[PDB]
Symmetry: C3
């Protein structure tokens, strides 16, 4: 039974289309989104059942790009493990969905967004979200949506809606916003030191722009929408609630007055364990029990701040935690630093390399190359846990990316600094926003390594607590205030402006007023941290490191250039492959060699002294014999029989000579 519904609307420069009822009919919901020539099939599947007493919402979004979308056969060996981009877009898509799924809805849902065709004029992430909104909306799955999304560029003082990839080459702002009709949900952006007034106006611009799509998706759901799932959250029995409150409230109140994190968490757990034990003394319950307990935590933490009382570690809403900053932390690194802000610590190591160390990426967008790679990883011992050490998690990529695009604007160009840079931020402790410590930390590690940055860059994490009209904007948030708070608001940049802005908003009905206030209280905190930073390292060091790849320089007769590059460019490639040294040659005459070592650096030249009289006493092998013998000196010259070892003269066959003349004679 095939009944195909299609809604079409016009989103700025492009025509968008949602189709349903043709493809993927067994999914709980599925939509074909086409925007320009960019097409995704977005299907959601949701289990009707949930595991009794589940602590988390098993939403999985899988965004996958098919190389047949761009007309290309996959390069390596089919499509392999997820590309960094795929991981990121899955994460970009997940974020805004999550808060729209009702509190307490634990059924596992899976969103799969597959790119069928990719148009260069239309980046995929935007219609992906539009699709996910539409698919979840069709499904009937409990959802508070529908959410739209928009990308906003900034060029010539105007705002660009849904810019292409090239168009962004001209933009100082790359920003994706996603929200509902009434509220902004999440924001991801990089920018070059733009002012808060611009960042905010950009979030608002997109939030207005996307309304057309949220309307369209909304009515699409009207026409073709399935039946709304009858569903309700797990129930709490207030008899038990009262019981839990009377027993744990006073203890939680103080337990939350413990400044030191691990001491706090231990005490909380003890309260939690006494509870469970106190209950048993008399599988859903324990969940129902945990629900009540968590609600209590929330109210306790929240009502403290809302009433003017001091925060968990005692700060007022406006004060950043204590910061200790060091550099030259590791002996063998090119650059390093240790950034400790409160209980959050990042050890950022910088490494340098030649083009050989540069990274090729493959994906839609075609095959490009990054000379700046930024890695971030988050080990279980920073949280005080025990876990598996396997490859980087979606957040570890997601946070690496954010930290990276915060820093990118101040990272020098290829022109000035002809290296490849690898930054690795390692979080050795995290009580909150380790993400921002990476930025801070890396800015120091980059300078400490001699990288000629435009200006020192730092970042801060904000949140708020709102009930009705009243709200407090928290600065330098800690894990608890993110978990029990209403938002996590990330701002990074230099003194002159914001390089990156990231928003995740749990609640709805947040206003530009609050947002406007949070961008500065952030701006303060940023400048506060910058000051404390600049006391250790204010500027990039005037030189790279000693163990850093350094160039070996030798000058060649511009005529002798015909050789070293070889016919077709083959001999220079042979050289760089054999020594692993990248060689750069002035059209005349100087050579500049990139050497990770002096051992190759010296191994790169010996190969170039080759391709490039006067005797000078060479040593070279005999090839032809006559009559004397032509030896091979690198060209050939005659050893006259008169000049063979004297006594008047065989004397050799072939295998192993001074040069005695030219217009080339030899002697022994």
């Amino acid at each position: 039974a095939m009944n195909k519904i299609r809604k079409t609307f016009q989103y700025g420069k492009h025509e968008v289309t949602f189709e349903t009822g043709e493809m993927a009919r067994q999914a709980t919901g599925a939509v074909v989104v086409r925007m320009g020539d960019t097409v995704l099939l977005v299907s959601v599947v949701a289990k009707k059942e949930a595991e009794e007493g589940r602590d988390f919402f098993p939403l999985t979004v899988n965004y996958q790009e098919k190389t047949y979308a761009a007309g290309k056969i996959p390069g390596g060996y089919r499509e392999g493990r997820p590309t960094e981009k795929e991981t990121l877009t899955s994460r970009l898509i997940d974020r805004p969905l999550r808060p729209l799924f009702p509190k307490g809805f634990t059924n596992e849902v899976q969103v799969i967004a597959t790119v069928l065709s990719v148009d260069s004029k239309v980046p995929t992430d935007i219609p992906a979200i539009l699709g996910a909104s539409a698919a979840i909306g069709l499904s009937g799955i409990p959802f508070n949506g529908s959410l739209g999304a928009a990308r906003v560029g900034y060029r010539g003082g105007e705002y660009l809606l849904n810019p292409s990839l090239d168009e962004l080459k001209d933009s100082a702002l790359d920003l994706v916003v996603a929200g509902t009709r009434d509220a902004v949900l999440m924001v991801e952006s990089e920018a070059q030191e733009l002012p808060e007034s611009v960042m905010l106006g950009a979030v608002l611009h997109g939030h207005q722009a996307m309304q057309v799509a949220i309307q369209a998706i909304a009515e699409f759901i009207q026409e073709a929408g399935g039946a709304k799932w009858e569903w309700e959250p797990p129930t709490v029995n207030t008899a038990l609630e009262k019981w839990v409150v009377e027993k744990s409230e006073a203890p939680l109140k103080k337990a939350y007055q413990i400044q030191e994190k691990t001491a706090r968490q231990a005490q909380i757990q003890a309260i939690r364990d006494q509870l469970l034990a106190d209950r048993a003394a008399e599988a859903v319950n324990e969940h129902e029990l945990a629900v009540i307990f968590h609600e209590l935590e929330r109210r306790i933490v929240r009502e403290q701040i809302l009433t003017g009382q001091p925060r968990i570690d005692g700060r007022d809403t406006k004060t950043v935690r204590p910061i200790t900053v060091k550099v030259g932390v590791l002996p063998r690194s090119h650059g390093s630093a240790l950034f400790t802000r409160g209980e959050t610590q990042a050890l950022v190591v910088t490494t340098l390399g030649t083009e050989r160390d540069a990274q090729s990426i493959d994906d839609l967008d075609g095959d490009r190359q990054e000379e700046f790679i930024f890695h971030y990883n988050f080990p279980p011992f920073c949280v005080g846990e025990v876990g598996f050490m396997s490859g980087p998690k979606r957040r570890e990529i997601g946070h690496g990316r954010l930290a990276k695009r915060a820093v990118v604007p101040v990272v020098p160009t290829l022109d000035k600094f002809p290296y490849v840079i690898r930054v690795v931020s390692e979080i050795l402790e995290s009580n909150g926003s380790s993400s921002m410590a990476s930025v801070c930390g890396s800015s120091l590690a980059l300078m400490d390594a001699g990288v000629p940055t435009k200006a020192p860059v730092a970042g801060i994490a904000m949140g708020l607590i709102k009930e009705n009209d009243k709200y407090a904007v928290l600065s330098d948030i800690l894990g608890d205030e993110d978990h029990l708070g209403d938002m996590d608001f990330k701002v990074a940049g230099t003194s002159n402006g914001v390089t990156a802005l990231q928003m995740d908003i749990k609640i709805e009905g947040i206003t530009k007023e609050i947002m406007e206030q949070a961008l500065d209280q952030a701006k303060e905190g940023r400048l506060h941290i910058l000051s404390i930073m600049n006391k250790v390292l204010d500027k990039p060091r005037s030189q790279v490191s000693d163990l850093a790849p350094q160039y070996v320089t030798m000058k060649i007769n511009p005529e002798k250039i015909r050789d070293v590059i070889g016919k077709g460019g083959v001999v220079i490639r042979e050289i760089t492959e054999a020594t692993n040294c990248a060689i750069d040659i002035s059209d005349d005459g100087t050579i500049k060699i990139a050497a990770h070592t002096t051992e190759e650096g010296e191994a790169a030249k010996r190969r170039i002294e080759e391709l490039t009289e006067l005797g000078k006493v060479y040593e070279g092998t005999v090839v032809k014999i006559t009559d004397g013998a032509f030896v091979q000196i690198l060209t050939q010259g005659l050893v006259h029989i008169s000049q063979i070892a004297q006594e008047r003269v065989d004397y050799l066959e072939e295998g192993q000579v001074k040069v005695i003349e030219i217009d080339v004679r030899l002697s022994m």
Copy 2:
């Protein structure tokens, strides 16, 4: 202590020896199979007890190829043998015929590992692998209905080939593996070039007759060297209870299965069950919990399979209302994706395939290194079976077993119609996305592939279609089901899939769960499947019946230039290092004819016109070492300055002019 028993016998051209009692002695059984110089160690291990409840049979086959078997050191750069397509596929090939041979209700976990110790090019490994499995299992004493042989059968010159090598299949119009017991064909797997059903069926029977010698060899080998057979029994019955559940539930159940609407139907069956459960409960009452509800479930489950089977056998319509011969609704579409080189959406009932074609350049060929390695594939056929197609949630990790197995079946269905590389100088990649599967998706993959390729302008020999079948057999009566649903394959005692063109079978796959499926039944089953695949062909032909007059503007193109033949040594270079570099540079296949042409394979134009330059410059303004001599491409004095004397116009010599 080691007691080593050997069995030597002739199989076709090759001497086969089984050994046991020397290696792998702690296995539940182990055999070293040798055929020609191909050698395998095949071992089986079975847990001695089933888990608490067990609803199924945990059979696992591991087939692995050591590269030392080929006297090679592995190419993988950490230099170790990620089970490959072939290793997976062959594992699945060995698995299939084993399953039906394990007795009903034997739930003990069983692992079969087949490792290739040495490889002979004359003797493909899978055949001895199946024989070895047959022997190890027999030796094990594990309960088994066996023992089974296998044979590969080729067709050349109108006559059958027994266990041919790859070299020999190059001249064969058929590649078919058949596995069976003394009395029965268990599984068939094959590709063929448009061969008629009787030649296909003839091959199955030729293999089945030909393998007997190996089955006999194994059977007596086992007799001699086997270990004590396991003492095992299928769960006891309660005949009285069964007769009672039947008398009670049968009439109502027959009426329930008259409801085509699932949720509505499953409701009734639950009612009938719950009622049955009450009735038993009263028949006892004061006796203590004498109602198990489990043994009842089993008896009940088995009764509804009987009943459904009976209804179809007596002419009743299938669960969805179709009779045995009718194929589900089909809808075909081409050119569904803007940026694809070709595409199709094939939907048959609830089975649906989005198939996409990508045209590519010699640069895109996927290399393969294995036993019989150093191979390039210009035809790349992938397959995808996402959780949502069956309407559930599942991980996305890598190609699954089924995805390889199904994907591969589809590929061998299509390959016979795919143009030779001389005729169509493109590498092809077809990716099959199964959006909806209840049905046979793999055959949908076939139909969609045939459409996708033509849509892309691939000059396929002819459109190819495929269809999946099932067969119910109760005693002497049987029914042949066309285009079976998913739930229908457990209904039947054998399932087969047949793909081909209007003129012949390009692939045939058979899995048989029972004994006494005759050449006659097969003959008739294949006919109904033919009538089916033509029905489907006719439908798809209405959308696109022949390849497109040309290639998508989005596909790779040839760029053509003319050169100086005397300069060919210059472009190819000394040793051929120059032309190499050019390709790895621009990523273009550069094929230089004797004189004087150059054909350049280019994905984009930019890549192509780049190949042009590096060529041209190397053959046909600027910027040295008074007088000028700047030299530019790898010497104007008056015209530096007429002002006399600081500080390519071109006309041993070689004097001018630059500036």
Copy 3:
């Protein structure tokens, strides 16, 4: 802040411990530095226990930035534990485990990350010192702490904590860790060195070690927090008491019985007759039964009674041997000793087949490739099939035992790949892999210096009484207080491994142990040699061949080309390793005959 920094001197290098600055949230963490080698070591002990086994997991990881390098992968990151990383993790794990108190089920995870690496300081030792010190601060129940040292041999003199370059000139690379009191674990490779030299190295390592152990013991004081509250569970003498009085006599008679069936019958019977009368008057029973069971058998061997299979302590299981078992392999050997069996295959290749391993030891080529596969069927089990830890662990021991008798590449210009299949394992199969290798390399005509063998041993020590067990069964592993394995030639000892549970093990004995090992070694060797004595005078026909040709000296550069590009194309076209005499002939290393005469058709046109 603090930031407590202890500094001492280990031999040539200055070692530095510190804490309080970083990884504060961890149960404990230390930054250990030796020379310029730096490792963050951290220990997280999970809050509360759960179990009957010890969930200890050590992860030693290497960051490329420690070496100033960017990872060579496609993703430019490090996601794939290297064989090295897995090996070191295993190595750091061994000496720690036995130090963790009896009946401590609390889950512990130690993470040692290399943040900096010096060519003069191998990363092994500072890691172990740092793990020992990290666990120190955690306050986690521990009977430690310990330290580690490496010992080399150059010109009759031992070398403390030698570097990679220096090891080149050492006849010995030996790692040892131990508590102040006693030695715990040893891992070594030597070139046919005497037992006296090896064991002297274990002592030397143990003596030079105390400096570190002291430094550590102090570092804890200056910094480390007070211990964890803990104590061996619920010890019930009431439980012990009754069991014995109703248990020993019937059970000690149940092990005088033959191999199995009459064992698992009567024993299991006892587990009933005693199961029956218990309730007349918790799994806790299951143990103190097994522990008694242990004691029973431990005793019986000490009194010189049959081992579980009927063997005495000195006799090695019957050994059968075959070479050239597989038709198409370059070399083959099937080595069965008792119920342990290894099929081992030799494959030779051109320089094109050489291993490229990149890591903190610098970019390198390996022409000797050794692999070890331990499939589930050898033990009679079903299991899943990337090689596990123990496979690399056992594989690596086997390798280093064979390496010293392996020809240098100039003497035998072939890449070698040895693969060892364990088709049966009861009693050490890592040693079966060594015995299987000699034969296989020799069957393949690989001119090994001498046939090599190895044996796995065990020691039961109760008080001052003990017994040294030869060719230990898998089920004799729990019995032993020491599990050591030994491999070597008719002359010296190639490889030595030891792991030690109890204390008070004295030089006076393991000396003896190392002998009884030598006996068996010699014994095994004698039986091997009568199958294959010396390497085959020839390399197998199927193996790569060297085609030799002679061209005109003047044209040597028409082959090699310009900068070397022409000669690289030929080797990358035909897959042949090619070299030219200064002026003269040309040796072509070819896999097949075609491939090799493909190299000729090319070299001729250039001529």
